[PDB]
Design a protein around this ligand. Structure first.
Ligand code: ANP
Length: 307
């Protein structure tokens, strides 16, 4: 395989002000913050993620693996990893996705989200994955919750705490999101780019139903059996057969039968030129979608390139 020559940047703690808390609980704490690189006269909105103070070998092992992945990817639809800070408690520094994650965004905005946005997201999510696929990299945790919103017109794939790289990954134990996983994954712990496709379909279904919970009510235990019966998730109200048909394709038992991300890009992108043919939403046409006196030298991460 090719040599992975990505650079890992180590940041001085003194190079960045924290400003507000964003997450807290599930593993670490996430902060809104600003990063003023060395003597650069730029300021970069970032998300700082250090881990729940007290440190365990078990924890750092994962944040660094994550950092390994995030640093080795460079696409407009995959999260930008900026660098790490090696203080007692290891901090991950990434691009601030101001509007939070997509799952929350859809719930909190259903009455103003139009087919144009929905299909654009679908397209942009597909491109992220196609790209990961070129880098021969398997996400293993694609879901509405793991796509972040930099602006409503620009989403990016995130969360590489499970990402892997061989024809199919053969996992061990650990806590897994059942309701998003292909069947080969549930029964054999096999993960290919095609099991990622399956989780794509579920993600799309999450978006089309404005953030429902797949198989809400059904417990994880039954799922393998349900999907074995031939059952899939229902057709979202707003969804033309065309769109839903693409979703169903994602959820086929013969994994080679499912579409390739590069095909998903094509199909959604066609649809995205005539959004209202493919998504029926009441109100569509009549719908549309920072805060410091000190914001003079602010530059989004996406314009802050380094060689
Ligand atoms: N780079 C970022 N920019 C903006 N908001 C973020 C960023 N990273 C995380 N958040 C927010 O903080 C929440 C929780 O942090 P996060 O670490 O993403 O979730 P988690 O519960 O630890 N598990 P996972 O979904 O696997 O990351 C997310 O759902 C986002 O709303």
């Amino acid at each position: 395989e090719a040599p992975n020559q990505a650079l890992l940047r180590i940041l001085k703690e003194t190079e960045f002000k924290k400003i507000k808390v964003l997450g807290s609980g599930a593993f670490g704490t996430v902060y809104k913050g600003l990063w003023i690189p060395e003597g650069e006269k730029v300021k970069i909105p970032v998300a700082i993620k250090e881990l729940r103070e007290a440190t365990s070998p078990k924890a750092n092992k994962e944040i660094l693996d994550e950092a390994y992945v995030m640093a080795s990817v460079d696409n407009p639809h995959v999260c930008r990893l900026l660098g790490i800070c090696l203080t007692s408690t290891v901090q991950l520094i990434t691009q601030l996705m101001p509007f939070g994650c997509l799952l929350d965004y859809v719930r909190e905005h259903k009455d103003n989200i139009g087919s144009q946005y929905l299909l654009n997201w679908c397209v942009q999510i597909a491109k992220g994955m196609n790209y990961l696929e070129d880098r021969r990299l398997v996400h293993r945790d694609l879901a509405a919750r793991n796509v972040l919103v930099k602006t409503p017109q620009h989403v990016k794939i995130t969360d590489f705490g499970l990402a892997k790289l061989e024809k199919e990954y053969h996992a061990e134990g650990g806590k897994v999101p059942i309701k998003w996983m292909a069947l080969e994954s549930i029964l054999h712990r096999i993960y290919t780019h095609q099991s990622d496709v399956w989780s794509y379909g579920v993600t799309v279904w999450e978006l089309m139903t404005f953030g429902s919970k797949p198989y809400d009510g059904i417990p994880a235990s039954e799922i393998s059996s349900i999907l074995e019966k031939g059952e899939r998730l229902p057709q979202p109200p707003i969804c033309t057969i065309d769109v839903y048909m693409i979703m169903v394709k994602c959820w086929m038992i013969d994994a080679d039968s499912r579409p390739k991300f590069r095909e998903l890009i094509i199909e959604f992108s066609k649809m995205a030129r005539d959004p209202q043919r493919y998504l029926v939403i009441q109100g569509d046409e009549r719908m549309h979608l920072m805060d410091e006196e000190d914001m003079d030298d602010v530059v989004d991460a996406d314009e802050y390139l380094i060689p």
